[PDB]
Structures are given as structure tokens and as C-alpha cells.
Design a protein around this ligand. Sequence first.
Ligand SMILES: [Mg+2]
Ligand SMILES: [Mg+2]
Ligand SMILES: [Mg+2]
Ligand SMILES: [Mn+2]
Ligand SMILES: [Mn+2]
Length: 271
Amino acid sequence: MIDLIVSQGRVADRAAWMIEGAARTARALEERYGLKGHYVGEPAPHADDDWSVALPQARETLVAVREAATESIKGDNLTVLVNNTHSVSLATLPVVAREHPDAVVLYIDGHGDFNTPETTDTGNLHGMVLSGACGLWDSGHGAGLRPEQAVLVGSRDIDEGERELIRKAGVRVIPPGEATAQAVLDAVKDAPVWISIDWDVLEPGSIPADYTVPDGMLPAQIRAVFEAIPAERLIGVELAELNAPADSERAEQAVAVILDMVAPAFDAAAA
Ligand SMILES: [Mg+2]
Ligand SMILES: [Mg+2]
Ligand SMILES: [Mg+2]
Ligand SMILES: [Mn+2]
Ligand SMILES: [Mn+2]
């Protein structure tokens, strides 16, 4: 009753071990739940390139992830995507919004990812993912997510340009100190639910990502979200931005903590 899809192609990766982090996460899920993952994309080298170069390069991987996501979301299994980068959600979020136009997206992240090409100060595609899914700019991978149905959980590092786009579009923001069961249940109400996680939401030290931003959520708060959302309401889960080298302490300890955070959802789905 779980479908596991794993991105292994470069999607604007600036960090060296996002593909390895995704692989280690997927292999641990495979072992815990006796799943066989659908691995898509071919690894390319990381680089600090503009979105205008990285997005074109990522098309093949994004289209293969979209195709596998569409097949699983049309079906009766919990859709689980283990994505190297948050940018893969440029492909998955338009699918979820087309299949489930009633769905609320819990976008669990330390940042807003709501810059456009006009507002971005870094040219990092990652900073433009949720705005892209919401059609504030054209990613070439579709849009159709209503910002009124997107909830930023745990965001604490939002540019004033980005904050303006977020308020006007009607994206709700739950800061990390308010990100409890009550606040998340108030946000999703009675809607079906898609969870999109960027591990940079977590208080630094624990689960390595690309970005390090203080005063974040704790692993138990993420576990509380998975415990709080009813199994009948959960469409699927996306896990992104584990930057963990092959065979490392950060790999084995991060993946133990991830297994613990997602167990309330995956144990229910796996039965
Ligand atoms: Mg790195
Ligand atoms: Mg293209
Ligand atoms: Mg279902
Ligand atoms: Mn982030
Ligand atoms: Mn992100």
C-alpha cells in the first residue's frame, strides 16, 4: 500500500550529496517496509548555476518523476517521493493539484521558496519552487496549485520581497514555535493532504541539508504532524534535501531519525 519513487537525477543540486541522501533514505524505507523503489534520473555533477541553466538540464528527470507520480496518485497507494532536491516538487505539485484540486499542501520548510525570477537575489531554482507550482511564474512543468491551499510550516527565513508575494497570493505561514498539531489541523481542516518536507526546516545539527538556519522545528514536531493527519486524508509525502555522504555517521543517524518522524504515516500505509 506504499508506492516509493526516488529521484536520482540532478535537479539544480548545488550540494554534493543530495542524490546520495535520497538513495540512503529510500533504501532504509525499502528495508523497513519491504518496498521496491522506482529510481528515476541519471546523476550529474552539482554546480552553483542560475535557475535558467539548471531547470532546462533537469527536464528529463522531472518528466520521469511526473510520469511515475501521476500513475501512483491515480491509484490507491500512499505516494512516497524521496527527492534529492526540493526542486523536484516543480513536477509533483502540479500533478497533486490537478488530481486533488481540494488538497491542502503542507509545505514544511525553513524558507518560503516563493521568489520569482524578478525577486530572486541568488538565481537558486530551489527558492522559486512553491511560487512555480502556484503559477506566479512559468516553470514549464505546469502550475494550478491555489496558493490559498498551500501552507508554509516552519518557515523562519523569508525575504521582504518574498513575504509580499506570500501575503498577496494568500499562502498561510505557521512559524516553527506555533507548528503544533492544533495549528496544522486548523490549516488543513477537512481537506485531503499532501506533505512536502525540506529537512532544512529542522533545528541545525540533526539532519544535514544545503541551508543552515537557526530556531527551527524539532524532529518530534514533524512526527506530531504525521501522527495528527488522519490516514484516510493523506494523499502522499515528499521528503527532500538530505545532504548526507555515502557510508557516513550523518547518513546512518539522519535516516534513523527520518524513519522515526514518518513512522506514524508509513506504518498505517504499509499494513
Ligand atoms: Mg555539500
Ligand atoms: Mg525545459
Ligand atoms: Mg490514496
Ligand atoms: Mn528550505
Ligand atoms: Mn525548500
